[PDB]
Every structure is written in C-alpha cells, then in structure tokens.
C-alpha cells in the first residue's frame, strides 16, 4: 500500500508514499524511539473546490538503528524514504532530534 | 479518489473514504458548499501508529435543492452524495448537517 518497512544487516528503511506533499509540509522527528512523520497538504480542486489532507504516522525503531544517523529523502514522485543505519558496539546515537526532509533532485 | 457529475436532474459526488468509519465522517452544507470531513484518532498498524484527517469542499450549483441532498456510504467505503436540481429561486436553501447513511 502506502507504507513499507525493510530491514537488512546494514539498515532499516521506511518507504512512504506522500504524493503532492512538499518538504515544507512534512515534519519528521525522532521521538522516544519512534520516527514521527506529520504532514498537512492543501490544494485547489476544480470548480472552486478544495481538499486538505493531514496525517500523523509513528514508526517503531529497532534498538540498533542509530537515531542520530537517520536520514529522510523525498523524491519528485512523492516517495519519502527514511534510512536508519544500524550499529553495533557502545555508541548508539540515541536521542530525540528533528530530521531534515531533503528533496532529491530527481 | 473523487468524481463529480452534474446533469439536468441532479448533482452527484463520488468520494473514496475507505479509511473512515461512518461515525468518523461529517457532511455539511455551509454557505452553498458541501463540506466533507473525515477524522480518526491514533490507530495501531503493523509498524507503529497512524491518524488521519481530511477536509473536502465542493461548490454546489445554485439550483441544487440543499434540503434534499442525501449521502450514503457503501461497505467498501465509497461515499455518494446526491442532490436534485429544482428551478425555484432559493428553493430548499439553508445550512444543514447531512447524515451519512450506511448502504449495507
């Protein structure tokens, strides 16, 4: 559907279709071992109509994802990709933070 | 997800609202527009949680009888709004809340 999670020995990946949402309309944060994605997008419709859509998603993070290294990219086609590098050892990089939503130039 | 039809007899809106239970939907006529809202609180899904809200507005043709607009919702989550057209000036005009009826 709209939301898929993948996991291999190197990383944890979330793929979320957010078609028509702009980077400025998306907020991505790490909060309490979840990645939180919030979006609100409005647009005109035919004959004076209007549609607004809002959502709030939380994805549970495995303990071995390095929260400080999570990235978020948005494609032209509206695919949001969250990438969470996995780590071993002592440095966990755990902590709440705001993740920049970076549009890729493709 | 949306389609609007408008012929000499009626105005019809088809809208996919599959994520929303009937009680999570509100349809109103406000200042000659139809406003449809869907809102649900945090649900659990396989990977975490999700909440959603939408607000969709449609401008009504001046000759739709607002008082006669009906709204039904299919088991598959398709909303159908229908309003007959009438010739009389301001016939049936007025803000109202339109109950979303289950089709079964």
How would you characterize the overall build of this protein?
By secondary structure, the first copy, chain A, is mainly beta. Chain A has a single domain, classed as Immunoglobulin-like. Chain A is 0% helix and 56% strand. Chain A is built from no helices and nine strands. A five-stranded mixed β-sheet of chain A has the order 1-2-7-6-9, with no helix packed on it. A four-stranded antiparallel β-sheet of chain A has the order 5-4-3-8, with no helix packed on it. In chain A, β6 and β7 form a beta hairpin. The radius of gyration of chain A is 15 Å and the shape is elongated. Chains A and B meet through β5 of A and β4 and β5 of B. Chain B: One of its GO terms (cellular component) is cytoplasm. Chain B: Residues 90-104 are annotated as: Disordered. Chain B: It is found in: Cytoplasm; Nucleus. Chain B: Keywords: Cytoplasm, Eye lens protein, Metal-binding, Nucleus, Zinc.
